[PDB]
Design an enzyme around this catalytic site. Structure first.
Site, PDB file in Angstrom:
ATOM      1  CD  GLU A  73     -31.579  15.960  10.011  1.00  0.00           C
ATOM      2  OE1 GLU A  73     -30.566  15.456   9.429  1.00  0.00           O
ATOM      3  OE2 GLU A  73     -32.132  16.994   9.582  1.00  0.00           O
ATOM      4  CG  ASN A 131     -22.753  18.202   4.867  1.00  0.00           C
ATOM      5  OD1 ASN A 131     -23.709  17.503   4.607  1.00  0.00           O
ATOM      6  ND2 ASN A 131     -22.501  18.633   6.089  1.00  0.00           N
ATOM      7  CG  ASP A 162     -19.904  22.465   3.301  1.00  0.00           C
ATOM      8  OD1 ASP A 162     -19.737  21.328   3.745  1.00  0.00           O
ATOM      9  OD2 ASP A 162     -20.524  23.327   3.896  1.00  0.00           O
ATOM     10  CB  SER A 213     -19.205  20.753   6.904  1.00  0.00           C
ATOM     11  OG  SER A 213     -20.403  20.681   6.140  1.00  0.00           O
ATOM     12  CG  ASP A 247     -24.580  17.150   8.450  1.00  0.00           C
ATOM     13  OD1 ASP A 247     -24.097  18.226   8.670  1.00  0.00           O
ATOM     14  OD2 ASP A 247     -25.339  16.934   7.522  1.00  0.00           O
ATOM     15  CG  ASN A 253     -22.590  21.115   8.957  1.00  0.00           C
ATOM     16  OD1 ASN A 253     -22.504  20.226   8.118  1.00  0.00           O
ATOM     17  ND2 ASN A 253     -21.860  22.183   8.905  1.00  0.00           N
ATOM     18  CG  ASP A 272     -28.021  30.571  15.067  1.00  0.00           C
ATOM     19  OD1 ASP A 272     -27.315  31.282  15.814  1.00  0.00           O
ATOM     20  OD2 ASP A 272     -27.815  30.391  13.841  1.00  0.00           O
TER      21      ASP A 272
END
Ligand SMILES: [Cl-]
Ligand SMILES: [Cl-]
Ligand SMILES: [Cl-]
Ligand SMILES: [Cl-]
Ligand SMILES: [Cl-]
Ligand SMILES: [Cl-]
Ligand SMILES: [Cl-]
Ligand code: NA
EC number: 3.2.1.17
Length: 129
Positions: A35, A46, A48, A50, A52, A59, A101
């Site tokens: 990562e 990202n 969208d 967003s 990270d 995120n 999650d």
């Protein structure tokens, strides 16, 4: 901060990630390598809108507040900047929420594509733990 491999393994072990939700320490070290290349200051935007953040690329759409991800949540209840600290506490604490999650470490795309089903014990080989 750019961690060394064993240095980060030790830090993650001290913060209770070894076997957290059944994932061995080598899984977490592998995820961090792919990562962020073990750099706490890593950021990536990202498509969208967003972003990270940090060693585990958490995120802003779900987990942290950066003030520029409209309609997003802050499920870890932290500013995303906390995830870029030399102290990995906030990253680890939020990663525990994420891995709980429902999809486990599949939440981390680099883990699914580059660590899952590999010899992840190699990532802690030789470390004094
Ligand atoms: Cl390495
Ligand atoms: Cl392991
Ligand atoms: Cl926001
Ligand atoms: Cl929220
Ligand atoms: Cl905030
Ligand atoms: Cl630390
Ligand atoms: Cl799982
Ligand atoms: Na957010």
């Amino acid at each position: 901060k750019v961690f060394g491999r064993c240095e980060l393994a030790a830090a993650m072990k001290r913060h209770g990630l070894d076997n957290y939700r059944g994932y061995s320490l080598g899984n977490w070290v592998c995820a961090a390598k792919f990562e962020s290349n073990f750099n706490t200051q890593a950021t990536n935007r990202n498509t969208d809108g967003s972003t990270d953040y940090g060693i585990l690329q958490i995120n802003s759409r779900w987990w942290c507040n950066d003030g520029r991800t409209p309609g997003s949540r802050n499920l870890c209840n932290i500013p995303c900047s906390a995830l870029l600290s030399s102290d990995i506490t906030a990253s680890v604490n939020c990663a525990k929420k994420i891995v709980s999650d429902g999809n486990g470490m599949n939440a981390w795309v680099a883990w699914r594509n580059r660590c899952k089903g590999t010899d992840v014990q190699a990532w802690i080989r030789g470390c004094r733990l």
